[PDB]
Scaffold this active site. Structure first.
Site, mmCIF file in Angstrom:
data_model
loop_
_atom_site.group_PDB
_atom_site.id
_atom_site.type_symbol
_atom_site.label_atom_id
_atom_site.label_comp_id
_atom_site.label_asym_id
_atom_site.label_seq_id
_atom_site.Cartn_x
_atom_site.Cartn_y
_atom_site.Cartn_z
ATOM 1 N N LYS A 153 -11.224 -3.653 2.311
ATOM 2 C CA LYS A 153 -10.701 -2.721 1.323
ATOM 3 C C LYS A 153 -11.600 -2.597 0.095
ATOM 4 O O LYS A 153 -11.883 -1.487 -0.356
ATOM 5 C CB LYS A 153 -9.286 -3.136 0.913
ATOM 6 C CG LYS A 153 -8.193 -2.559 1.788
ATOM 7 C CD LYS A 153 -7.875 -3.433 2.980
ATOM 8 C CE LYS A 153 -6.617 -2.940 3.667
ATOM 9 N NZ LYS A 153 -6.120 -3.822 4.762
ATOM 10 N N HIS A 206 -4.835 -5.908 -0.380
ATOM 11 C CA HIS A 206 -5.046 -4.717 -1.189
ATOM 12 C C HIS A 206 -5.263 -5.017 -2.660
ATOM 13 O O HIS A 206 -5.651 -4.113 -3.405
ATOM 14 C CB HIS A 206 -3.848 -3.764 -1.059
ATOM 15 C CG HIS A 206 -3.921 -2.860 0.127
ATOM 16 N ND1 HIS A 206 -4.590 -1.658 0.106
ATOM 17 C CD2 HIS A 206 -3.420 -2.991 1.377
ATOM 18 C CE1 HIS A 206 -4.494 -1.084 1.290
ATOM 19 N NE2 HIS A 206 -3.788 -1.872 2.079
ATOM 20 N N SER A 241 0.815 -1.212 0.000
ATOM 21 C CA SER A 241 0.000 0.000 0.000
ATOM 22 C C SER A 241 0.851 1.265 0.000
ATOM 23 O O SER A 241 0.635 2.176 -0.805
ATOM 24 C CB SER A 241 -0.932 -0.008 1.206
ATOM 25 O OG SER A 241 -0.234 -0.396 2.371
#
Ligand SMILES: CCCCCCCCCCCCC/C=C/[C@@H](O)[C@H](CO)NC(=O)CCCCC
Ligand SMILES: CCCCCCCCCCCCCCCC
Ligand SMILES: CCCCCCCCCCCCCCCC
Ligand SMILES: Cc1ncc(COP(=O)(O)O)c(C=O)c1O
Lengths: 48, 43, 153, 499, 423
Positions: free
Chosen positions: D335, D303, D275
């Site tokens: 997410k 992610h 990230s």
């Protein structure tokens, strides 16, 4: 001219990290910067 | 001008001052050619 | 902020001297300190070159060999709580790239101050006694020892 | 098809990243800021002794002054001397549904952030670019949040037991057979916290006598799970296939630390998209390196699930690989799916061992029915079972937004990190004073971002992050780029030399 | 040394162990009982309708209409889940309204909330106890406390269960080493981890005698009252209210929002000087998403109902010593727990000789009892990964929903089936 002269002071506050300091702490740093640059000109007019 | 004095004052330098400075140059060389080595592990 | 947000490193105080531009930025600090002293009007050059060498070795001893711990909270449960910066550098590995630069630069600053002082006897018993106080702690044999138990806890 | 590397990996599409290094003059100026802040922080400590009473901080009780001081004073020196000065950038409270436009409650301090107070007014529309909201499933309307209210009117908010006991409902079994089909594996298990999926399951696989290979920038939950296992940990250079292969090679020939015996097993912990760096892992080269040294692979695609790939199946589908080459598959539901929880997927033999020997399965409470029903409905829209095209649009509308935003910023003169297909974009600011100014400038222009400082990263690598979403329109992306261009000229943030 | 020919042959010889070991098909667990519908008072377990005595919701609330209708009003205005780690746009105005409301209920100074009940105390302990510190821990502490103590690499000393003569014996030995090195004696912190209403035994700790030892040996207490919050006391405050102890003497008090509040998450309360430090170091608080807004709204309404009438704690205690006094007749099983605890156990007298056989005997009663109309379960532990493993037992849980007729008829049904399996 005054609008661009004030912009140059803003860039000096960011590089020396004086932007995130209190008003009495900025005056302590500005005091010895002009006191060390003012006495360096008097020594450059007695030995030069 | 005041530069000749320095070089002229270096040749009259005391024997004990030249030895110490010469011994410090032998240490730089010795420490410039050293391996890493992670201290003292489980020996 | 929180140690471990953008890097796995449990202690970021062991890789600070290996950063890009910290060697050339630390040499500019010694040069900047020597220019503000050289501006004092009522002082001779040999006194300037001794004050430059004593003040640098005084700050280099406090920041590298006296202050122990870390300035932030890390996830290694306070393992470097009783260590000085020098002992934390590179997780205790000896003779690395950075531990040679920091050992060599005071010696070089000692050669320039001996030649500019014209090898005076009074200036030799001040600069040699100050240079020893910063080379002794850097020996690999004094890693973690406290003489007479001073600066221990 | 495109090119093959010597490490056995085969790439089908070009894989290009970019990580420019900081200019010499800009690198030397950030040390001036940190010194001026350290020197000024030592003067405040000594000034709070025989002077300033600082009557605003917290202290011990009067009847406990003989006990050894609770905290170590030197630690938290940065907290009160550096973090306190610019702390009005982080804990901002919001009062609406977070996506693409969020309400923020205005607050102001009168003692330099030592204390705060809410004025009373609310900032109507702020372009949200600091929340993980890929695919934009975070809404308070639609047919996805209408089915969660139906499963909350006859189930209640939360359960009151554990899985191995009386806390295993029929809703928990419906979501586990659906997640296995989505991923394309044999079986799966769901837990209820993403942080706890890693820290409570990594210690049930490895123990004493095993080796863990960790990446340079792995998440804190992945790093804490390894700490509790009892195994040895060695780290390798980020995305370096020469550094990982040397660490993998010398670990088999030399054996264990002092006893010099063979290892019981070897486990490699990697991640999908990282990230804070914006980079994608090289799976074709990891997978062909773990087959040659018989190691195991633990992938954490928290992610990348939903965000990568041409249908939203993560980083395995993005490269063209098979999902049976990964021993363990971890991920989260917060997410991309607009929910909470985690999961682990794999063989039917690994999910049978984790159903009886995992810490979360016997000591922690299970997932909430209302949040389980949201994952089921949002996951069933990506696969296109719902019969609508809402899931084929959002997935392809995130790829467009990412290529247009990343390419327009690079031609302005900024220094951006990572891959070109990463939906997280880290802009680089180096000076410590720019962290507190870029945060205030954005919110004054009506944009919300995230900034990261020195302890969090390295000393010359302070940055801001720009999570992108599929709910951002072309109009919102144009308005954001205009305000970012003016603030980059005002603070002189265009550091790029190779433009 | 180590040539290139040998090196390549060394990598061909190695053969790792399998990721997960086999040899199952006999394990006591690995057979989750499927519950069809909400786990309410009347439940359906494995396609059978029966009154359950296994869920941990004491004051009802799971299906309270007012609690259900308040989580709906927070679902239609916020969505389902947050999208942030509470340090970046992850904190709503419901999280700030739940923390402020909890602190007024406990009459404390500040509170902090986590999003998972297990991690609230597994993240709070290692934030205060570092490598050189000494922790005195009861021997019957739960698994979350053990994991929190393991994460904080500090010196751990266990003492007998619920005897202060053994704790004071350990505190006097750390003091004999305080004259052997006084300079180090002033940089080590002392903690005492304890807990009200231990879950593994059903007993209550002596707090009054433990508070006098704190001031005499300069050690700090950490109360972990997850089973007594909302149960003990006259206002449901906990153990500190059951005795009359000033709340300021405890330091830290941790609990979860999953047992009496019928929701998800945990919380920690105390003074600001100790609470405001976990916000920047609590591992599960800084690197995890926050608690969904609809879950936090269901806890505030429970708090409102608990404070609205405090007479609900007097009915749960009067029917707690009614089923506990009607079970002191069974021949083969022995009751293990205090009379004021709603979660006491039911252990096996005269253990055969092996754990495996013990568990199969208790499973027999559990399966044979459910056939009627009583849902019970036995306590589950991780046998290899635990410090002091308790014996097998059948947990018995009491709520305010069960009536007098059901309480009496459930105590008689466990006698007839246990007197015909254990003889
Ligand atoms: C006009 C002024 C220009 C600059 C003048 C200031 C120069 C002196 C600043 C002091 C530098 C500190 C050196 C190392 C200090 C370490 O004990 C400290 C904790 O152990 N580590 C850091 O945080 C190190 C973090 C890195 C900070 C540079
Ligand atoms: C007094 C300030 C320090 C003197 C400036 C020159 C460099 C010395 C400080 C750092 C030396 C090693 C750390
Ligand atoms: C363009 C030159 C600007 C002036 C920079 C010279 C002084 C910079 C020193 C900053 C402090 C150095 C920290 C490293 C010492 C450990
Ligand atoms: C491995 C890992 N764990 C945990 C988290 C965050 O936890 P949650 O899923 O609760 O947001 C992230 C992000 C992550 O990458």
């Amino acid at each position: 001219a005054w609008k661009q002269m004030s912009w140059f002071y803003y860039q000096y506050l960011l590089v020396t990290a004086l932007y995130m300091l209190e008003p009495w702490e900025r005056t302590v740093f500005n005091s010895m910067l002009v006191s060390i640059v003012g006495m360096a000109l008097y020594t450059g007019y007695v030995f030069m | 001008w005041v530069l000749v004095e320095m070089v002229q004052a270096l040749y009259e330098a005391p024997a004990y001052h030249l030895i110490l400075e010469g011994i410090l140059i032998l240490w730089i060389i010795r420490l410039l050619f050293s391996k890493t080595y992670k201290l003292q592990e489980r020996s | 902020m929180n140690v471990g947000t953008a890097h796995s490193e449990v202690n970021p105080n062991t890789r600070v001297m290996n950063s890009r531009g910290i060697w050339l930025s630390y040499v500019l600090a010694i040069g900047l300190l020597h220019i503000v002293l050289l501006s004092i009007p009522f002082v001779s050059v040999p006194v300037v070159w001794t004050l430059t060498n004593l003040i640098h070795n005084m700050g280099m001893y406090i920041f590298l060999h006296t202050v122990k711990g870390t300035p932030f909270e890390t996830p290694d449960q306070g393992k470097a709580r009783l260590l000085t910066h020098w002992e934390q550098m590179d997780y205790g590995v000896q003779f690395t790239a950075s531990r040679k630069f920091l050992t060599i630069t005071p010696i070089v600053l000692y050669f320039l101050t001996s030649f500019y002082t014209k090898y005076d006897q009074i200036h030799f018993v001040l600069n040699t006694v100050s240079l020893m106080s910063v080379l002794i702690p850097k020996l690999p044999q004094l890693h973690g020892v406290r003489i007479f138990g001073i600066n221990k806890y | 098809i495109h090119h093959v590397t010597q490490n056995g990996g085969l790439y089908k599409r070009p894989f290009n990243e970019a990580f420019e290094e900081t200019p010499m003059l800009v690198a030397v100026l950030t040390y001036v800021g940190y010194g001026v802040l350290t020197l000024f922080g030592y003067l405040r400590d000594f000034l709070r002794y025989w002077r300033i009473e600082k009557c605003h901080h917290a202290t011990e009780r009067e009847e406990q002054k003989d006990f050894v001081s609770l905290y170590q004073d030197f630690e938290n020196f940065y907290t009160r001397n550096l973090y306190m000065r610019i702390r009005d950038n982080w804990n901002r409270p919001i009062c609406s549904v977070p996506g693409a436009r969020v309400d923020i409650m205005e607050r102001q301090s009168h003692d330099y952030n030592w204390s705060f107070k809410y004025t009373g007014n609310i900032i109507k529309g702020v372009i949200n670019m600091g929340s993980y909201n890929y695919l934009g499933f975070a809404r308070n309307t639609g047919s996805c949040q209408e089915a969660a209210a139906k499963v909350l009117e006859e189930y209640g908010a939360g359960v009151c037991s554990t899985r191995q006991e009386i806390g295993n409902l029929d809703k928990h079994e419906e979501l586990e057979e659906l997640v296995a089909r989505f991923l394309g594996v044999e079986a799966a298990m769901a837990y209820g916290m993403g942080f706890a999926t890693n820290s409570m399951n990594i210690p049930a696989l490895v123990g004493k006598g095993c080796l863990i290979l960790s990446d340079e920038l792995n998440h804190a939950s992945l790093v804490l799970g390894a700490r509790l296992s009892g195994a040895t940990i060695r780290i390798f250079k980020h995305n370096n296939m020469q550094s990982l292969e040397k660490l993998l090679k010398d670990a088999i020939v030399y054996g264990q630390p002092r006893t010099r015996r063979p290892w019981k097993k070897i486990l490699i912990l990697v991640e999908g998209i990282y990230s804070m760096e914006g980079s994608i892992v090289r799976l074709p080269e990891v997978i062909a390196l773990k087959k040659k040294y018989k190691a195991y692979l633990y992938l954490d695609e928290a992610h990348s699930i939903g965000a990568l790939g041409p249908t939203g199946r993560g980083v395995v589908e993005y490269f063209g690989l098979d999902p049976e080459d990964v021993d363990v598959m971890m991920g989260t539901f917060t997410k991309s799916f607009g929910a909470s929880g985690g999961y682990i997927g794999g063989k039917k033999e690994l999910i049978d061992y984790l159903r009886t020997h995992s810490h979360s399965a016997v000591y922690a409470t299970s997932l909430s029915p209302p949040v389980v029903e949201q994952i089921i409905t949002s996951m069933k829209c990506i696969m296109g079972q719902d019969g609508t095209s809402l899931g084929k649009e959002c997935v392809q509308q995130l790829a467009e937004n990412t290529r247009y935003f990343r390419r327009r910023l690079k031609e302005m003169g900024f220094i951006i990190y990572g891959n070109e297909d990463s939906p997280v974009v880290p802009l680089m600011l180096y000076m410590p004073a720019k962290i507190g100014a870029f945060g205030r400038e954005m919110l004054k222009r009506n944009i919300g971002v995230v900034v990261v400082g020195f302890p969090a990263t390295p000393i010359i690598e302070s940055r801001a992050r720009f999570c992108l979403s599929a709910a951002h329109t072309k109009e919102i992306l144009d308005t954001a780029l205009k305000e970012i261009d003016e603030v980059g000229d005002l603070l002189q943030l265009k550091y790029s030399r190779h433009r | 040394d180590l040539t290139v020919k040998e090196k390549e042959e060394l990598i061909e010889e190695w053969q790792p162990e399998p990721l997960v070991p086999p040899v199952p098909k006999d394990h006591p667990a690995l057979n989750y009982n499927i519950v069809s519908g909400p786990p309410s008072h009347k439940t359906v377990v494995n396609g059978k309708e029966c009154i359950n005595f296994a869920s941990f919701n004491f004051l009802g609330l799971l299906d309270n209409p007012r609690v259900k209708a308040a989580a709906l009003a927070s679902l239609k205005k916020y969505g389902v889940g947050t999208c942030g780690p509470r340090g970046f746009y992850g904190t709503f105005d419901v999280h700030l309204d739940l923390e402020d409301r909890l602190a007024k209920f406990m009459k404390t100074e500040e509170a902090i909330i986590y999003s998972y009940g297990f991690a609230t105390i597994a993240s709070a302990i290692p934030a205060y106890s570092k490598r050189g510190d000494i922790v005195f821990v009861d021997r019957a502490a739960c698994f979350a406390i053990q994991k929190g103590l393991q994460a904080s690499r500090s010196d751990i000393k266990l003492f007998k269960h619920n005897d202060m003569a053994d704790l004071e014996r350990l505190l006097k030995e750390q003091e004999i080493e305080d004259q052997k090195n006084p300079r180090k004696a002033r940089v080590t912190r002392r903690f005492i981890v304890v807990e009200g209403l231990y879950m593994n035994t059903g007993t209550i700790c002596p707090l009054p005698e433990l508070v006098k030892l704190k001031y005499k040996y300069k050690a700090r207490i950490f109360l972990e009252e997850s089973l007594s919050f909302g149960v003990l006391g006259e206002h449901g405050r906990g153990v500190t209210e059951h005795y009359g102890i000033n709340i300021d003497d405890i330091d830290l008090i941790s609990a979860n929002m999953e047992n009496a509040l019928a929701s998800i998450g945990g919380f920690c309360c105390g003074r600001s000087f100790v609470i405001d430090h976990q916000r920047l170091s609590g591992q599960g608080y800084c690197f995890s998403a926050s608690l969904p807004p609809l879950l936090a709204a269901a806890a505030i309404e429970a708090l409102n109902i608990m404070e609205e009438n405090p007479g609900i704690f007097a009915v749960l205690k009067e029917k707690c010593g009614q089923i506990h006094k009607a079970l002191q007749g069974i021949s083969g099983l022995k009751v293990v727990g205090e009379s004021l605890s709603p979660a006491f156990h039911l252990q096996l007298e005269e253990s055969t000789g092996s754990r495996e056989q013990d568990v199969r005997l208790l499973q027999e009663i559990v399966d044979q009892c459910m056939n009627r109309s009583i849902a019970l379960t036995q306590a589950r532990y991780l046998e290899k990964e635990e410090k002091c493993l308790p014996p097998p037992s059948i947990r018995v849980v009491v709520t305010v929903e069960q009536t007098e007729e059901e309480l009496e008829r459930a105590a008689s049904t466990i006698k007839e089936v246990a007197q015909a399996v254990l003889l």
